[PDB]
Design a protein around this ligand. Sequence first.
Ligand SMILES: Nc1nc2c(ncn2[C@@H]2O[C@H](COP(=O)(O)OP(=O)(O)NP(=O)(O)O)[C@@H](O)[C@H]2O)c(=O)[nH]1
Ligand SMILES: [Mg+2]
Length: 168
Amino acid sequence: QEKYRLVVVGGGGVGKSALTIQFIQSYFVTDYDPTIEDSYTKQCVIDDRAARLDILDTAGQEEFGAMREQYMRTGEGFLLVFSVTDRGSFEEIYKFQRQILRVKDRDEFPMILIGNKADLDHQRQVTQEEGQQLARQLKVTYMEASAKIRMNVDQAFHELVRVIRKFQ
Ligand SMILES: Nc1nc2c(ncn2[C@@H]2O[C@H](COP(=O)(O)OP(=O)(O)NP(=O)(O)O)[C@@H](O)[C@H]2O)c(=O)[nH]1
Ligand SMILES: [Mg+2]
């Protein structure tokens, strides 16, 4: 009888939807269809403790920036996603962290930094050490993922739940 409202945020095209669809439906989307805001649910067992995960897949497009206050108010944990092949998305993810903490009026709040598209090994603009450094700056953990090859997809969501449980 436990549930978590998880929210996937980050800049446009970094793979928020591809990660979420791989997690929910176990298939990889090739087309890039920009999201306004989509919702999904999954029943999981994390550390032998069952939990329903209600996932909000949000807009990376600035056009829909005004919807952030609403979803940031109600989110219980956030996956901060950037693409390792897009340095702009890497430099911009801190803006999402700042807005979450401003809406929560808190110095810390459950989050994890995800460097997606790690399968694009020959196209990287951000090294693994750079992502780990940014995570330390933001006081969160770092995980690299690939929606394409389904690397660390379930793990990213499970780990966010673990972080949320430690904040309680
Ligand atoms: N090689 C590779 N491509 C990926 C990966 N994740 C997403 N992509 C791709 O990158 C594009 C955008 O992915 P998408 O999930 O729609 O990104 P998004 O962050 O939801 N975009 P938006 O903010 O506009 O909703 C796609 O064409 C998709 O196939 C990945 O892990 N590896
Ligand atoms: Mg999307």
